[PDB]
Design a protein around this ligand. Structure first.
Ligand SMILES: N#C[C@@H]1C[C@H]1c1c(C(F)(F)F)sc2nc(Cn3nc(C(F)(F)F)cc3Cl)cc(=O)n12
Ligand SMILES: N[C@@H](CCC(=O)O)C(=O)O
Lengths: 284, 278
């Protein structure tokens, strides 16, 4: 007897921050640079991130560009919601089991575990085949994150195009970057090097570039540019390749799909989306 | 129901119109018709056979092939892109709304009010609102007090747009004062606007980002530039407009995302949009 929307998100700074709750089950009161209070939501999710391990669901605190967008969408469309973090910690790809199955947030949405995906989820042909994407709430692309000093021209650098156990580069397992390198034959040499060194999450891969375990990390520029502007020991190299958008994920039968997109269009047109970029991305 | 009526509108480099050869359409051009009136005291007119090429036309050719449909392309003669006058849509949007066209292909900006009457495809070109000025002009962007409060300056900053499109609509909705001040600087089109800028008759030209970026990248002497690193306000994209609940939308969305994935899209940007100025 619940018409409350189940929302699935993923930890991905600066879009979704995931911090523990205070001893009393609430979120620490915080403030933006403009003195406004940081809007936070309780997001349930696993504490043990290890693969093939039991998942003990715990309440956590969620905030960021995607949470502010969720709150705006909820107020505008007059719906109630509940936020949980993706049980397996993945964005989502279709993998062969004869049968093919979607994992991550894609898996959760298609199974009815989630009613909506509110995360930096890339719009691509593979996912658009099974789910409805809203109009983009962010246009971005792919770039490389290296340690300051490491010199690369871009995707057309022989240290990448001609791989070797000398220069270890990767992306995130079961993500859109993973789908991109796999579908394109033009990048099969790169993909085969990558598949052996891919990380479970972007945070892990970003720390690996810091703890000298990874040389280059191919990922979303919205995330990477933000990370390079915060951690001055890391810099993004090259321009942008495979320019892509992030959209809200729903099932093809959702009675919200039209109003979700109109709301995103309004927010781009009235400066609300630009304000989110100001508050969460365009700083330091 | 494989032969589709499709509307377009001339806007270089997206859609380029040409006269037919001495006696059909050659090379990368596709046939496109334009209804031309006999006189203005009549409704009588003739469809002139013209040829169409450009970025958006190459996108049409790929969709026609991938999505497997044939078409009859025509140029809109009622409005331009789309304006709601007294609740009646004109331009390319009107053609789709009143079912004279199955789809509109061109430099058509996706916006909320148009989305209420037509279905749009995924955006295939990033656009929005940019500001073109002579290199060196000191303006922060649309939010600059030179635009927002123009009479606070002596003499006041001179700026206009090409009215009746998505840009003016957006300025009308967000900056009421700026909008009512700008209307005396309304430009008949992009070409007039650039001439007024180059001849010191205009200080800034506010318009579609993708068109302004193309124009600065090809400016003779690279004098005219877009503010910021060619910055985009109210970021949006061009989309193919389709009738509401159209069966063609699914196939068209997947093909476009396929074209982006495959590298087919970057090839068109190289072929039509790249410039000399940087
Ligand atoms: N998805 C997708 C398509 C493939 C990617 C894409 C373009 C591509 F060149 F790749 F064809 S150009 C582009 N602009 C925006 C900019 N944009 N457009 C909107 C609008 F559609 F909502 F108006 C909002 C924003 Cl940001 C978003 C976007 O995703 N894309
Ligand atoms: N591309 C715009 C026209 C140009 C503009 O007004 O920015 C539109 O579809 O209305």
């Amino acid at each position: 007897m619940s018409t409350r929307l189940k929302i699935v998100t993923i930890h991905q700074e600066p879009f979704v921050y995931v911090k523990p709750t205070l001893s009393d089950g609430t979120c620490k009161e915080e403030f933006t640079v403009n003195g406004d209070p940081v809007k936070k939501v309780i997001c349930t999710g696993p504490n043990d991130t290890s693969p093939g391990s039991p998942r003990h669901t715990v309440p956590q605190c969620c905030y960021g560009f995607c949470i502010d967008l969720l709150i705006k969408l909820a107020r505008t469309m007059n719906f109630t919601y509940e936020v949980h973090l993706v049980a397996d910690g993945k964005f989502g790809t279709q993998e062969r089991v004869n049968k093919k199955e979607w994992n991550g947030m894609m898996g959760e949405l298609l199974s009815g575990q989630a009613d909506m995906i509110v995360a930096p989820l890339t719009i691509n042909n593979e996912r658009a085949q099974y789910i409805e994407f809203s109009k983009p709430f962010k246009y971005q692309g792919l770039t490389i994150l290296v340690k300051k000093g490491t010199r690369i021209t871009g995707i057309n650098d022989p240290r990448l195009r001609n791989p070797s156990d000398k220069f270890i580069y990767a992306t995130v397992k079961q993500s859109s970057v993973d789908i991109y390198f796999r579908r394109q034959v033009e990048l099969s040499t790169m993909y085969r090097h990558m598949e052996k060194h891919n990380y479970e999450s972007a945070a892990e891969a970003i720390q690996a570039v810091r703890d000298n375990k990874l040389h280059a990390f191919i990922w979303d520029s919205a995330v990477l540019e933000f990370e390079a502007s915060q951690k001055c020991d890391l810099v993004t190299t090259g321009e942008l390749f495979f320019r892509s958008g992030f959209g809200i994920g729903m099932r093809k039968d959702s009675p919200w799909k039209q109003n979700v997109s109109l709301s995103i269009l309004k927010s781009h047109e009235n400066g609300f989306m630009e304000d989110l970029d100001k508050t969460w991305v365009r700083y330091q | 129901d494989n032969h589709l009526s499709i509307v377009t509108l001339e806007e270089a480099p997206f859609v380029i119109v040409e006269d037919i050869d001495p006696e059909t359409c050659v090379r990368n051009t596709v046939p496109c018709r334009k209804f031309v009136k006999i006189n203005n005291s009549t409704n009588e007119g003739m469809n002139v056979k013209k040829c169409c090429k450009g970025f958006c036309i190459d996108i049409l050719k790929k969709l026609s092939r991938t999505v497997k449909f044939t078409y009859d392309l025509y140029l809109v003669t009622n409005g331009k892109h789309g304006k709601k006058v007294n609740n009646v849509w004109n331009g390319m949007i009107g053609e789709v709304v009143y079912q004279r066209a199955v789809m509109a292909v061109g430099s058509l900006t996706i916006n909320e009010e148009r989305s209420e009457v037509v279905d749009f495809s995924v955006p295939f070109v990033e656009t929005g609102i940019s500001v073109m000025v002579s290199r060196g002009t000191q303006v922060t962007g649309l939010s600059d007090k030179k635009f927002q409060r123009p009479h606070d300056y002596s003499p006041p900053f001179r700026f206009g747009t090409v009215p009746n499109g998505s840009t003016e609509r957006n300025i009308r909705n967000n900056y009421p004062y700026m909008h009512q001040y700008m209307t005396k600087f309304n430009q008949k089109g992009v070409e007039d606007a650039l001439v007024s800028l180059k001849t010191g008759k205009l200080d800034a030209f506010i318009y579609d980002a993708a068109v302004l970026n193309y124009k600065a990248g090809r400016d003779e002497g690279c004098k005219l530039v877009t503010i910021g690193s060619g910055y985009i306000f109210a970021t949006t994209g061009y989309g193919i407009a389709l009738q509401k609940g159209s069966p063609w939308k699914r196939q068209i969305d997947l093909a476009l995302l396929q074209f982006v994935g495959d590298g087919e899209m970057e090839e068109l940007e190289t072929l039509w949009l790249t410039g000399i100025c940087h």
